[PDB]
Amino acid sequence: AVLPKGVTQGEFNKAVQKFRALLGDDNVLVESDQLVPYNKIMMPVENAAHAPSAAVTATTVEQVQGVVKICNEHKIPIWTISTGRNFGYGSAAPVQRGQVILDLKKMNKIIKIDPEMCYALVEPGVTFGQMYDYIQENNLPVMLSFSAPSAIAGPVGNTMDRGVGYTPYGEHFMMQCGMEVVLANGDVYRTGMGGVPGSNTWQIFKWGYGPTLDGMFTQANYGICTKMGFWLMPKPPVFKPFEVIFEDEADIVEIVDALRPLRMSNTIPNSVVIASTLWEAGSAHLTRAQYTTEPGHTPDSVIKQMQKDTGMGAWNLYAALYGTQEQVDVNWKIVTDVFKKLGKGRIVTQEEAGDTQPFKYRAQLMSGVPNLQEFGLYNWRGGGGSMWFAPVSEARGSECKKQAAMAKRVLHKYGLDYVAEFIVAPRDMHHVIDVLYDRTNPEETKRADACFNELLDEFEKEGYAVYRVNTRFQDRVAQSYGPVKRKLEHAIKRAVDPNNILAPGRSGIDLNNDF
Amino acid sequence: AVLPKGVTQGEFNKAVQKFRALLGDDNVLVESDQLVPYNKIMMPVENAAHAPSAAVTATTVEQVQGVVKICNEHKIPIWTISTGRNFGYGSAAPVQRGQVILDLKKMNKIIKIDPEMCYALVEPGVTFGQMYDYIQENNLPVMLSFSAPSAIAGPVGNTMDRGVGYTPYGEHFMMQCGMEVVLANGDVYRTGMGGVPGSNTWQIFKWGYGPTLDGMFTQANYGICTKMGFWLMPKPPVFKPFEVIFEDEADIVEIVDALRPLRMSNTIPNSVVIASTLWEAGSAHLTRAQYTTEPGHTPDSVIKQMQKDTGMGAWNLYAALYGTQEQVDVNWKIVTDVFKKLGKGRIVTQEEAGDTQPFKYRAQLMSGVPNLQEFGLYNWRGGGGSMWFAPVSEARGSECKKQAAMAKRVLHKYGLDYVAEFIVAPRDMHHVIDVLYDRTNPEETKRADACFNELLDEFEKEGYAVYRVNTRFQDRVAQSYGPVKRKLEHAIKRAVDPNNILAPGRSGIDLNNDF
Amino acid sequence: SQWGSGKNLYDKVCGHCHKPEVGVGPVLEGRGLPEAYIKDIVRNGFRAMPAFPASYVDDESLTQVAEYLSSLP
Amino acid sequence: SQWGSGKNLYDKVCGHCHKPEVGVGPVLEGRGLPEAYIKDIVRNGFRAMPAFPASYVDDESLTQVAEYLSSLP
Ligand SMILES: *Cc1cc2c(cc1C)nc1c(=O)[nH]c(=O)nc-1n2C[C@@H](O)[C@@H](O)[C@@H](O)COP(=O)(O)OP(=O)(O)OC[C@H]1O[C@@H](n2cnc3c(N)ncnc32)[C@H](O)[C@@H]1O
Ligand SMILES: *Cc1cc2c(cc1C)nc1c(=O)[nH]c(=O)nc-1n2C[C@@H](O)[C@@H](O)[C@@H](O)COP(=O)(O)OP(=O)(O)OC[C@H]1O[C@@H](n2cnc3c(N)ncnc32)[C@H](O)[C@@H]1O
Ligand code: HEC
Ligand code: HEC
Ligand SMILES: [Cl-]
Ligand SMILES: [Cl-]
């Protein structure tokens, strides 16, 4: 059946025999029926291309050390997942056909949540839902940060891919402090202060001494993360979410330039999300089929009608205010006067859009309470086809108009929509585009793959590169960053993983490459 | 004369010949009289132990590539410095006797200072003084962050050692974004977004794609930094510095615990410095000799008298408030009410301690204006002996009392003083101790070396390790973090520097070690 | 039991998309859908709906959620 | 010239410690200290005072600062 690249049936059988002896029978999965749920992908390619050979489930660090020991003996490529909810990025499926999946979902212990120092030390399988229950049950004054998958996703996996949230602690890797990784040679390495016997500073001081290597492991294949610590925001006494609706599409240029100094001075402490009409629509659970059944993209005419019927704008911005009532009231006056001086957009408060969607879910995401509302984006066209295309730019308004026109032009060419949002951070602007299509339709699927390649080519030409991408385009994106980087990355890979067992192909790092 | 470890006179002469042909004659220094200023150290050891064999000065990246090419040919160990003002950490002198100094002081071009996106891209030789002039001349609304050496020190060198400042952008490495390093093989690697052709995001988005390696280069010897970018704080319309003087030494326990939530919620955005009497004294330019001439430490009696004469407390805290007048007035009320509820300490404003020292220098350091006032600390006992001993702990008040007593006991044993300050960050607290002694007195020098070793032993036993240390104790501190870390660090070293030419010994990383 | 009860697996996972007030997925409450069907949709996933491996939601919790869903109005 | 004038090197480097109002180092203004002495202190450093290499402060700027110091009251 499905076998690892370069491994023979007999050599694979010796490996599976050793996996069983170490882990047990119910922890080693080799049958198609139990391997099928790992194969579910939203990428424009057949399942066979990212089909795993086996799936092992470890619960302890000693077991992970055992698994890599066996993998080195029989040159078995292993793909590590934590919660495996990487939708639009490859899901739980390997980067290459035939790798064994090291599923650490069962390694789900919340080791410590300090309510005074405000940190958490967790294992891979811990979900944000599991963490939220523990925080609500034990009445801890901490707040959590996550993205839409929230409840079903986890801190470790999201951070290993350097994911983002919507609270002031939204830059997840920036709030990460301390991690434990098991290297290819079985050694257990702890970053920062973790290597010091009897220390209580692992989740307190980031760097440690000597080279600080947490970053070396994120978006890489040089170790398997078994423990990870991060900082938690103390729960503020007052939370004030707001929305600003904008009628015209050209308004994006003036909004971003007006919002940047407020975001840079920390007056608006969380990342400001400016959502397009179609993003706003899919999240409010409207489908394309209830407006038009015509082929190709959704015309400007129907988008204009969607705006009229619902009251949603061309651009819908969401942000929040945190602190004491007095500091919130002061920051409120500063934010209000900026929008008044601009003479555009209407302010929508928690008073006005009470229990209404999409305000309710965004307000929840901005205060760390889980909900999966934004999954409606997959109902816009349906079919289970979705890929994230997300380049980065300066938080400059002229960059919005430039990138939007570029994206819109390539999307429409293939009959796909411009479903996007800008996430404005202090200096960096993120153009998150969800290229949504119908994966059950083979013709639309072939166009989506083509559309994705062209979006990469078009943007790379104007100097833009993506910072996270699906498994299928991981080697391609590695090329946007140049040869020296790739040469350095393969040099480190030969040093820590001589046998090329640790997820070869992840971020374009594979020893079978000529670097 | 002085030669590199393992290099013969003839092999060194071929290398110096090639250095001359590449750089010129006035860029290659081999005579004792021009090499002597690099040798000046405040460490308790004779100059001969950290004496360089030569000193080359490069001005371009192509020259640095040429230097490493020559160094690989004749196995010449190279020690890189930028501004070389690393006082109390090794200064500009090598970690090992006989290495050649790559002095990049002349590579001093300010490449770009964006006043809108608020960033700077500089070369190694740029000083904070040079940057401050450029900012004052060109009327840019940016603020700079640095420590006491300020004017004469630089952004690149301070950040390569992960140094700290006193403004909200005080955690320098956290504000670093994009760097260019030349590897041992002559390759020019750019982190984050710098590898992407035509990009304008190098100083905008930190991570990039794939493993993010900026941290791998800091406090390490895997590359020579030739360019570095960092974020600059936008100049706030209102700056409000303040001081809180405390009479009793036991007050430190209640101060820290009361200040932590204000520092964690960002009400006090800059790192709170709580200075001891002797630190405060040395910075106000008082010497020990004008109070007592008795041998050993300064007795509690005279410290009590120093407090009476000057009005300085046992602990003197300095912090600042930034923003608009309205947000400053609100944060002022919150800070004021916390000190009132505690019933301890008196508030000293900019109104009261006008042009008085030490308030004036700390207020300047907190607003990015350079001054070298704190160099008075070297006048406390004089002689030019100074080493920094700085462990890290949780920002917990009980930790102040514990570490202080431990430090004070070991310092007094050897006749040295407890000159220290706590720098309270959101969760971490730094115990910066300046072990000051007279380096001209050979007996006091031998005791200082012994005192330093014992402070490391004593603290390591209670689970504390330092995160930055002088060149002489760099191999020793590497041991506090464990063997696996050292094994991983030497594995990466073999991969990027097979010939062991890039500063062997830096942070305990040397290929002549058995790891 | 991995999720304890069927009501628990529903409140913590399924309900986040399926509860009538949310509406990402169709209502499953009191529709009488067979356990064998609920198992194949969860293990294979269905178009917009993701798949959950046994490690996340085991066979036993699937039986419990199937039973909890039938018993509701 | 590296620092342009002698007054410039003084204002940018030396004066930060040496100007009478600061007081980290002794007053150098109008004391008539020989150029050869000012060169040896800067190149060797002196106890609390650090050393500056030629790359930082060249021989020519040292002559200029020596001359600027003598000419003051
Ligand atoms: C569908 C949807 C997805 C979204 C989203 C909105 C919608 C509607 N919005 C997102 C957003 O704003 N921000 C994000 O960062 N992501 C968004 N996503 C996608 C989301 O599913 C993921 O970001 C994230 O939660 C991925 O899921 P996960 O948390 O389960 O992570 P993972 O287990 O899949 O691991 C991710 C990746 O990391 C590597 N790997 C994982 N774990 C390890 C360990 N322990 N050691 C080494 N490598 C590891 C691996 O390559 C894996 O694929
Ligand atoms: C005397 C004193 C020193 C202080 C201080 C107070 C006083 C009174 N307070 C400090 C503080 O609060 N914060 C700090 O972080 N440091 C304080 N210091 C020490 C201070 O001198 C240093 O922090 C700093 O300014 C060091 O000087 P520098 O800026 O000149 O840096 P450097 O050139 O000496 O480089 C430091 C270190 O970095 C490595 N190296 C340098 N440049 C490179 C490149 N390009 N590539 C690779 N490695 C590089 C090298 O090991 C060097 O020694
Ligand atoms: C959001 C991410 C979901 C979670 C969590 C669960 N389900 Fe789901 N489910 C979802 C969608 C969007 C759909 C419709 C898919 C389509 O393309 O039509 C579904 C559908 C089902 C069905 C089919 C019902 C039918 O009317 O035929 C079943 C039986 C089902 N889902 C079950 C189910 C269970 C048991 C879940 C928890 C383990 C669960 N779903 C979670 C979206 C989401
Ligand atoms: C602070 C970091 C200093 C800077 C910058 C400069 N000097 Fe200095 N200098 C400093 C001190 C603390 C001392 C006293 C040292 C001691 O322990 O006695 C000095 C001393 C001198 C002297 C000798 C003065 C005398 O003998 O009366 C000279 C000639 C001198 N310094 C010169 C000098 C020049 C030219 C500088 C700029 C290039 C300079 N100093 C900078 C501290 C500091
Ligand atoms: Cl996917
Ligand atoms: Cl030193």
Side-chain angles (χ1 to χ4, degrees), chain B residues 220-499:
Chain B
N221 52 3
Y222 308 128
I224 296 158
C225 176
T226 49
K227 278 174 199 61
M228 201 189 78
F230 58 104
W231 296 331
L232 296 167
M233 191 176 134
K235 204 168 184 168
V238 178
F239 166 60
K240 186 151 196 300
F242 68 99
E243 183 191 358
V244 196
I245 306 182
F246 294 89
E247 301 183 73
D248 198 51
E249 199 192 281
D251 295 350
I252 197 64
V253 189
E254 287 180 270
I255 299 164
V256 175
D257 290 326
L259 272 284
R260 179 190 57 236
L262 295 185
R263 187 57 197 108
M264 222 189 260
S265 64
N266 227 238
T267 306
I268 298 172
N270 69 324
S271 10
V272 177
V273 182
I274 317 171
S276 68
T277 317
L278 301 188
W279 187 294
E280 194 79 349
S283 69
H285 306 173
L286 299 171
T287 56
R288 190 183 175 274
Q290 67 169 81
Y291 272 91
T292 175
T293 35
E294 215 70 56
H297 68 270
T298 304
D300 294 86
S301 320
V302 27
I303 292 175
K304 187 188 169 291
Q305 186 59 38
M306 291 185 84
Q307 287 180 225
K308 176 76 189 69
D309 296 341
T310 54
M312 296 175 343
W315 295 109
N316 307 252
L317 106 54
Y318 293 84
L321 256 47
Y322 315 70
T324 65
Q325 193 57 73
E326 290 89 356
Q327 62 206 165
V328 170
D329 291 328
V330 176
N331 285 324
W332 185 244
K333 203 92 172 182
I334 305 179
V335 174
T336 284
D337 293 353
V338 177
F339 285 124
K340 196 177 289 174
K341 264 289 171 64
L342 203 59
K344 287 177 178 190
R346 53 167 183 116
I347 288 86
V348 186
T349 45
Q350 196 172 211
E351 239 259 302
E352 295 174 45
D355 257 66
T356 335
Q357 286 297 348
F359 191 100
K360 184 179 184 174
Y361 100 87
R362 309 229 73 140
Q364 283 180 345
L365 250 43
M366 292 188 278
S367 59
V369 9
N371 67 81
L372 297 226
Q373 180 85 12
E374 205 179 69
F375 270 73
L377 245 56
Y378 304 164
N379 292 330
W380 176 252
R381 283 181 172 249
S386 178
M387 285 181 287
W388 299 101
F389 177 72
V392 59
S393 77
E394 304 193 299
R396 189 102 66 177
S398 70
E399 288 280 347
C400 284
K401 169 175 278 178
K402 186 179 195 301
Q403 288 184 292
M406 289 170 68
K408 202 183 282 194
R409 184 225 133 217
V410 182
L411 288 166
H412 293 188
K413 169 176 172 176
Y414 295 89
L416 289 341
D417 283 318
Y418 175 71
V419 189
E421 65 178 11
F422 286 92
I423 302 174
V424 347
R427 289 158 180 93
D428 51 313
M429 190 175 61
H430 307 281
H431 196 187
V432 187
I433 303 157
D434 200 355
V435 357
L436 297 156
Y437 66 104
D438 191 335
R439 199 172 167 273
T440 72
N441 180 328
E443 193 262 312
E444 196 152 304
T445 284
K446 216 177 174 185
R447 297 198 324 265
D449 193 58
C451 173
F452 206 76
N453 274 288
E454 200 172 316
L455 277 160
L456 290 175
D457 287 342
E458 283 294 280
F459 279 73
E460 194 172 310
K461 247 202 290 177
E462 291 290 320
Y464 305 103
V466 298
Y467 54 84
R468 191 177 176 195
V469 75
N470 69 80
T471 44
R472 176 175 173 71
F473 294 85
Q474 270 183 36
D475 181 83
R476 169 62 190 87
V477 175
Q479 287 161 25
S480 310
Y481 292 82
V484 178
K485 178 160 180 301
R486 301 201 70 185
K487 204 192 294 169
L488 179 59
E489 289 176 358
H490 291 259
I492 295 164
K493 181 67 165 172
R494 216 168 293 128
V496 306
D497 191 16
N499 292 335

Side-chain angles (χ1 to χ4, degrees), chain A residues 79-87 89 91 104 124 128 147-149 152-158 160-166 220 223-226 279 374-375 377-378 388 421 423 468 506:
Chain A
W79 174 260
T80 309
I81 63 169
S82 290
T83 38
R85 308 294 81 197
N86 219 9
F87 310 125
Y89 294 109
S91 288
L104 307 174
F128 284 111
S147 40
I152 62 160
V156 181
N158 176 265
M160 287 305 289
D161 224 25
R162 296 191 299 259
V164 286
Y166 303 104
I224 293 159
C225 177
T226 52
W279 187 294
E374 207 179 67
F375 270 72
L377 245 55
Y378 304 163
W388 299 102
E421 64 177 16
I423 302 175
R468 198 175 175 209
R506 168 78 158 129

Side-chain angles (χ1 to χ4, degrees), chain A residues 15 136 254 304 399 497:
Chain A
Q136 291 294 286
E254 287 180 89
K304 188 187 169 290
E399 289 281 345
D497 192 17

Side-chain angles (χ1 to χ4, degrees), chain A residues 281-292:
Chain A
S283 66
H285 306 175
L286 300 171
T287 56
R288 190 181 174 274
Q290 68 169 80
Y291 272 90
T292 176

